[PDB]
Write a protein that binds this ligand. Structure first.
Ligand code: JFO
Ligand code: MG
Ligand code: ZN
Length: 313
C-alpha cells in the first residue's frame, strides 16, 4: 500500500510536461507508466502485483518494428497522463483508469502495416474485421491479456463498472483508427461552434475521448524538434517497408511510402500537419483549453518542416 514509485528529479519535473520524452532506457518505461497511474488515478486503483504482470505481458505482445513498438505505447500513455492531469476535475475515476490502459494497449501486436496493406495482401485479420482492422485486433489482444490468470487489473470493479471500463477501452482503441478521426473532429467542431457540446451527454464524451486518443496517438508531432525529427525516421522506415511490400504485390505505392521518393517527405509531413495534426490539436484546445501546449508545440514543428523545405536544414 505505502510503496510509491519515485523518479529522478529531472524526470519527476519533466514528466508533468506535454513534451516529455520517456528516454532510451527501456527498463525505466514500466516504472514511468506505474508512476503515472499512481498520480493520475491513486495507489489503490490497481493491485501492483497484477498491474506489473499486465504491463510485462503488454510489453511482450508489442513487436520489434521501427515505430509501432512498446516505446510508442508508453509515449501515447504519457500524453494521455498530461491531458488528464491538466484537466483534473473533467474525468471520472473509471475514465482515468480506462484511458491510460487503452493508450498502453492501443497498438498491441502491430506489424508496422496499415489497414490498406492487410486488405490488399488479403490478410486473415481483414476477413475477420472489415473496418478498423488492426484496431479491432488491438482491442481483442487487450481482452486476451486481461483474461490471463493474475492479469485482471479490473477484478475489484463491480460487474457494471467492469462493463463500462471495457466499453471505454474499446471505443478509445477504435478511435485511434485515423479514417474515423476526420468525421469525429468535424462533428466536435460543429457541436463546439453551434454551442450544442455537452459533456454530460455520454455520446458527446465518447467523441471528446476519441479526439483525446487521436491527440495522444499523434503526440510525436508535439515534442522538441530533435525528438519529432528523429521519430519521423522511425515512422518513414515502416512506410517504406510497406511501400516495398506493395511493390511485391505489383502495386505502385503512394509516394509517401516509396523509398525512391524520400525527397517528398518534408512536403508529406506538411500535408499531415495541415490535414490532420493542427486541426486535431485546434479542436482539442477549444474543448480542453489547458491542452494548448500541444497545439503550440505542433505549430512550432510545422514551422521546422517549412524550414527543412526552404533548404535552411
Ligand atoms: C497514417 O498516415 C500518416 C501519414 C503521415 C504521418 N506523419 C506523422 N508524423 C505521424 C504520426 C506522429 N503518427 C502518424 C500515424 C497516425 C495514425 C496511424 C499511423 C500513423 Cl504512422 N503519422 C502519420 N500518419
Ligand atoms: Mg494504431
Ligand atoms: Zn498508435
Amino acid at each position: 500500500g505505502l510503496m510509491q514509485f519515485t523518479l529522478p528529479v529531472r524526470l519527476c519535473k519533466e514528466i508533468e510536461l506535454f513534451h516529455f520524452d520517456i528516454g532510451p532506457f527501456e527498463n525505466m518505461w514500466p516504472g514511468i507508466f506505474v508512476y503515472m497511474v499512481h498520480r493520475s488515478c491513486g495507489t489503490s486503483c490497481f493491485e501492483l502485483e497484477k498491474l506489473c504482470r499486465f504491463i510485462m505481458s503488454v510489453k511482450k505482445n508489442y513487436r520489434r518494428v521501427p515505430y509501432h513498438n512498446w516505446k510508442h505505447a508508453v509515449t501515447v500513455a504519457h500524453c494521455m497522463y498530461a491531458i488528464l492531469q491538466n484537466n483534473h476535475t473533467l474525468f471520472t475515476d473509471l475514465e482515468r483508469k480506462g484511458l491510460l490502459i487503452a493508450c498502453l494497449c492501443h497498438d498491441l501486436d502491430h506489424r508496422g502495416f496499415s489497414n490498406s496493406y492487410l486488405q490488399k495482401f488479403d490478410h486473415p485479420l481483414a476477413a475477420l474485421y472489415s473496418t478498423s482492422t488492426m484496431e479491432q485486433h488491438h482491442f481483442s489482444q487487450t481482452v486476451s491479456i486481461l483474461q490471463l490468470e493474475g492479469h485482471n487489473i479490473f477484478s475489484t470493479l463491480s460487474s457494471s463498472e467492469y462493463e463500462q471500463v471495457l466499453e471505454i477501452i474499446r471505443k478509445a482503441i477504435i478511435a485511434t483508427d485515423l479514417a474515423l478521426y476526420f468525421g469525429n473532429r468535424k462533428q466536435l467542431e460543429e457541436m463546439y461552434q453551434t454551442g450544442s457540446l455537452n459533456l454530460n451527454n455520454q455520446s458527446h464524451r465518447d467523441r471528446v475521448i476519441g479526439l483525446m486518443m487521436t491527440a495522444c496517438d499523434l503526440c510525436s508531432v508535439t515534442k522538441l524538434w530533435p525528438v519529432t525529427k528523429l521519430t519521423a525516421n522511425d515512422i518513414y522506415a515502416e512506410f517504406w517497408a510497406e511501400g516495398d511490400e506493395m511493390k511485391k504485390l505489383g502495386i505502385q505505392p503512394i509516394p509517401m511510402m516509396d523509398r525512391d521518393k524520400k525527397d517528398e517527405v518534408p512536403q508529406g509531413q506538411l500535408g499531415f500537419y495541415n490535414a490532420v495534426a493542427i486541426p486535431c490539436y485546434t479542436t482539442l484546445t477549444q474543448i480542453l483549453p489547458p491542452t494548448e501546449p500541444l497545439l503550440k508545440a505542433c505549430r512550432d514543428n510545422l514551422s521546422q518542416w517549412e524550414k527543412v523545405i526552404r533548404g535552411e536544414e
